[PDB]
């Protein structure tokens, strides 16, 4: 009914974003493990697998977040990478 139409129209899915690490030929594998542990709360085993995905697949998804939180993860990870003088790029794509 009218109430039911109002309900339908308020069920637009959240805008979510994958946060992604992109491979490069200069960033140490150990540093990527560090990144995944420090900023994404991965245990060492899971961090190591994702890091290997970055290296062998070209990129890996670190997790999926609201747009606001995703932009905050990207900013932090890149800052941490630059201050350690690595080119590691963390970016976003809409899920």
């Amino acid at each position: 009914q009218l109430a039911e139409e109002k309900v339908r129209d308020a069920l637009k899915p959240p805008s979510m974003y994958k946060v992604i690490l992109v491979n490069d030929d200069y960033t140490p594998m150990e540093f990527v493990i560090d990144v995944l542990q420090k900023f994404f709360s991965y245990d060492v085993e899971r961090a190591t697998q994702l890091m290997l995905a970055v290296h062998y697949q070209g990129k890996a998804i670190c997790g999926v977040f609201t747009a606001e939180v995703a932009e905050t993860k990207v900013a932090m990870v890149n800052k941490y990478a630059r201050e350690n003088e690595h080119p590691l790029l963390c970016t976003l794509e809409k899920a």
């Binding site: 491979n23 490069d24 030929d25 960033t27 140490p28 594998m29 890091m51 970055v54 290296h55």
Partner: peptide
């Protein structure tokens, strides 16, 4: 990415 130097077991 860059793999770390392996640490030799045998001397």
């Amino acid at each position: 990415l860059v793999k770390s130097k392996a640490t030799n077991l045998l001397y």
